């Protein structure tokens, strides 16, 4: 459970990690080797020259002799530096590349395995758990695992080796002066382990909070139309901000932990080698050792602070990866009982289609304490049609869901041909069944691709036959792009009847032996339903079919009618057989350019955090300049140490040095904590602010923006989770250490200018060489990051669509198809990662090699400077010591380039989305707010074309009127434009030509929120939230807090209060995602209650009683009649029972008013209205 990641490594990855780790140990010992020949050899030679100095004795010959002696040695050391840098180029490329390649391969495998496990889970698991969290994790937690298993591990092995290599060199050059450091090393490791565990624990909770926020974002962006209709933008933003705040607090805790860890590490190493300083100096003045502090061993153990400071962030990244892997691998390791990928089961060759339910007891996992089916008995003979009738919530859809083995009954057996379906192969069982859900769901692709989900190997002739049987051929052939025309998410860019007929065809292409029809004709008009029913009855003999129809005309022709009452079959028989019993059936039939200043503009939104940046930059300057100043202070200490007079009096300086290194350690602790913490807190504030502003801007947009193919729910959620994380990757501790290293380089340059002005030219020469490689690398990485961000949204779209439509995906047995699509969508990012591995490796290797080439050049040039009597040897050594730290700082800065490109791209996109302004702005306080509404709605010659299919005319000209106390009934064929009128009255879109009036005022001159607050709308396919029944009902009026009594009154008006009260947890019963844990009629009634809680002046009913039963719709209609006068109501209905009482009926055909008048007038006249009610 600790190396749970690295689970999917294989032979090649294990070799990349060993060879990369071998290179990292070889890379790490180059710097100690640089100190070895600089310290042990040259400093000793210089001291011997000063110690064995005879003043002006044979000066003319001796000066030249010693100058040549040191110059030859320095040239040889320059050659050694060149040789070390030559191998540094290879070892550094391997260290970085090999660890990046292994990380990329492992992350690819982890993503594929995670998506496979999510698709392999069960329907009950999906009901119990939340799924927007899964969608957010698949991106964010996988990226977090990636940032901790890659080249940062190689960077840890490299600094660990520098620390140890320095220790080993010190041990070789002196005894017992490094055992003190080696004894405190375990304390440092223990501290590292403790704070790594703390940070991993914090990361787990922070990712939980981010997943909770992403779930809210996903639900809101999937129900954006309901959110906009009910003015819920402000409450949905508040819900998102609630989780953003928890994530921000956890991130601040993470920053405190990590930065106090870094500060404690620096304090501990400083105190540890300060004790060594004191003890060793006491023993050296005791003459136990001669040279232990003279620039050899104290300069070998000086790089330990740099090593620890460089190793700590990689430990933090590893801890974050461990925290991220928890939930991912928990989901991966979860195994389902009803496994749809197992090959363990029977696959009968010839199935005659006999279905039997024997004593079925079932209760849902989400509500165990509610019994749905209690001893259900049902037999379906071969090639027979059986109709399930009864009141809503009776378990009719539960029977269909059990027939597909989405759940297992708690008692009893479901069997096919006398064989238990539990022993049949699950994939085979689901493949021999075609099912149409109560409210069908499509996918964001073309019509032909949607139909191919039923059967992949289907041909175009078979598709045409299926859409002829589904009565969709004419509607598809009247479209541009015909079968290749692209539908929206869930089929949103099609009308209800068209979307349902597409699903009917998708079921038909499977050639199913068992056909499950669940309210398959709810959204179909009577004319289309007739031909669909004829087509179904033309091929009934080949298969056995179960139909759940509220339309009772289709029930009459069924072979056997089953009746549901109290979770059992009360009356089973034919039409006349049940007419004999005159029971339930009788009662029922009785009536771009990525600008370079994007990252600076995103940092101006942190202007309120300027005091945090000031102190952080000051602390970064202090601790960055401390590193080069160490050489100067050590050189000054050497002066008071080489000859202090009496050996015993040296104890004063001995205790002075311990105080110096202890105060220095305290200062390092304080400054490192400040530098990390202030920048981290500013970054945590910035991340939350950016996420908040992006979500608010997304909620501000128009419906046409969400209708775009590139703005799907998955793409939007991926954008939300990704743009903030990429910007965060270049802020905080990274941006702090960037300033730290810049101040380090500046301090080195300044002391070089003060002491030797010649080597400053070498520094100003090495800077551009690293700079050019950095800029070309950043150019390549940004160029590829644009496409990486473009392609990641597609994979997010695939994952979100599969997870949100998991029930349909499982019914169609299309898990493997979506896995293939996800894998294919991962291809371009994977290859870009593989190429970035080599690019980053080669750039890092070039930078590191240039560092050692600069060291060699500095040595060679200092040789000439000393030869020409320009610079003293001690000054040359001091400036070279500065140059080493400066070059390391420059390389560390260059290592920040990969993050900055992604940050710039994401910052540009964030700026663009934030600054975007819609046309129909709902956040605008401008517009008229009439003080008196009379409920007069007039459409005056409205011409409208949808933005996604602008070539198609929807409404050629539309003129209808309605006043207070009147009901306007919209009738017509599917796709006529009835639901477009509702969306135009809701100001979802503006008409191309024409006008819509409210009490004589143009609705474009009104306030958008004010106008929407006067409308009560229930959509054709109502959508709820994964919240309580009470929250869903109270969502109708988001301006005020709705009382419990008012919620109960609305529920009673909607004829749902009895069900809610007879249910455990009552009104606090959490509804499923989109209302899936309710019956269809129950969800429709909850939406009716949500609409009625407003007491709206205009009531918009769009097939508001499609999922209801006869008694329920009668009660709802009586309530509407009781609240009829005093409000304007527009009704879209197919049933004659909801049109008879309408004041005026308008027949809209082809987006025009064809027939108008009262029911009596339209029935007396002969035409479309008379034809539609023939039977
Ligand atoms: C040997 C010198 C020259 C270099 C020092 C190398 C160490 C910095 C690293 C590099 C490889 C590492 C090893 C890589 C993998 C493993 C296996 C690991 O055990 C398992 O993988 C199996 C147990 C489990 O499933 O968790 C225990 C740590 C260990 C020995 C690691 C210990 C630390 C090692 C030796
Ligand atoms: C300081 C040390 C690391 C230097 C030692 C010499 C290296 C340059 C050699 C020694 C072993 C070699 C590796 C041995 C085997 C392989 C497998 C070889 O073939 C594959 O399995 C690749 C398959 C694929 O790419 O799909 C790829 C290169 C690699 C890692 C080699 C790359 C070059 C390595 C690291
Ligand atoms: C001084 C001598 C010893 C040469 C030192 C460097 C080599 C060891 C380098 C140079 C070319 C490198 C190879 C160039 C390209 C590849 C392919 C690369 O695989 C991919 O690009 C991944 C593609 C995928 O996974 O689909 C794996 C490493 C490998 C073998 C590299 C291994 C390391 C190599 C041999
Ligand atoms: C480059 C050389 C000079 C040293 C660099 C690395 C070291 C600082 C060592 C000392 C402690 C080591 C660790 C000691 C214990 C573990 C836990 C170990 O976990 C397991 O595999 C547990 C199961 C098992 O014991 O097999 C994995 C390796 C790791 C992190 C080791 C990795 C290498 C570390 C960090
Ligand atoms: C010589 C100094 C300067 C550096 C040495 C650092 C290592 C000794 C530390 C750094 C990070 C540590 C790792 C951080 C993460 C973990 C998980 C942690 O596991 C737990 O105890 C919690 C697991 C659980 O939740 O059950 C301890 C082992 C391990 C591999 C740690 C092993 C020791 C490591 C490698
Ligand atoms: C402070 C941070 C930056 C350093 C931490 C380093 C170690 C904790 C890691 C780095 C690479 C890891 C190794 C990478 C790959 C594997 C294979 C992997 O194997 C399995 O767990 C197989 C399980 C299965 O096949 O089901 C785990 C052990 C091991 C040796 C890992 C042991 C722990 C290691 C040495
Ligand atoms: C920043 C680095 C990585 C790129 C630029 C490299 C220069 C800083 C180095 C590389 C070659 C060096 C030269 C190589 C050899 C010599 C000859 C050397 O004199 C001799 O060996 C004999 C006397 C003579 O003939 O001049 C004086 C220094 C000089 C000019 C060196 C000066 C510094 C140079 C230009
Ligand atoms: C081509 C790319 C990688 C950038 C160029 C950087 C290095 C290749 C340069 C910068 C520093 C140069 C070195 C600076 C100084 C010297 C000393 C000088 O050689 C001598 O010492 C000659 C006398 C003798 O043989 O002892 C000229 C070569 C050399 C190694 C230079 C070789 C080329 C180096 C490594
Ligand atoms: N996933 C679920 N988790 C918990 N309870 C559920 C779930 N799905 C349905 N229910 C409950 O199952 C019961 C049976 O309703 P079911 O979905 O079987 O509808 P039905 O009887 O076919 O009626 P309708 O005509 O409305 O479709 C209801 O009480 C409903 O709220
Ligand atoms: N968002 C959209 N983008 C593009 N075209 C759309 C969109 N929504 C609907 N359409 C199309 O506009 C036409 C009008 O459909 P509309 O939703 O108004 O039908 P309706 O009269 O309410 O009928 P139904 O009872 O089938 O829902 C149809 O051809 C439909 O496919
Ligand atoms: Mg149903
Ligand atoms: Mg409609």
From Swiss-Prot:
Reported regulation of activity: Translocase activity is inhibited by verapamil and is sensitive to energy depletion. C1orf115 regulates drug efflux through modulation of ABCB1 localization and activity.
Name of the top EC class for this enzyme: translocase
Residue ranges, Extracellular side: 34-79, 172-178, 280-293, 635-658, 756, 860-875
UniProt: ATP 1 binding residues: 390-397
Domain ABC transporter residues, every copy: 355-591, 937-1175
Pfam family, one: ABC_tran
GO molecular function annotation: ABC-type xenobiotic transporter activity; ATP binding; ATP hydrolysis activity; ATPase-coupled transmembrane transporter activity; ceramide floppase activity; efflux transmembrane transporter activity; floppase activity; phosphatidylcholine floppase activity
Any one GO cellular component localisation term in the record: plasma membrane
Binding locations of ATP 2: 972-979
Leader sequence residues: none
Chain positions carrying an annotated carbohydrate: 50, 54, 57
Entry's transmembrane regions: 11-33, 80-100, 150-171, 179-199, 258-279, 294-315, 614-634, 659-679, 735-755, 757-776, 837-859, 876-897
Entry annotated with the keyword Cytoplasm: yes
Protein's membrane topology: Multi-pass membrane protein
All ranges on the Cytoplasmic side of the membrane: 101-149, 200-257, 316-613, 680-734, 777-836, 898-1175
Domain ABC transmembrane type-1: 17-320, 613-902
Record key words, sorted: ATP-binding, Cell membrane, Cytoplasm, Glycoprotein, Membrane, Nucleotide-binding, Phosphoprotein, Repeat, Translocase, Transmembrane, Transmembrane helix, Transport
Subcellular location: Cell membrane; Apical cell membrane; Cytoplasm
PANTHER family tied to this protein: ATP-BINDING CASSETTE SUBFAMILY B MEMBER 1, ATP-DEPENDENT PERMEASE MDL1, MITOCHONDRIAL
Family from the record: Belongs to the ABC transporter superfamily. ABCB family. Multidrug resistance exporter (TC 3.A.1.201) subfamily.
The name this protein goes by in its record: ATP-dependent translocase ABCB1
Organism classification: Eukaryota, Metazoa, Chordata, Craniata, Vertebrata
Protein encoded by which gene: Abcb1a
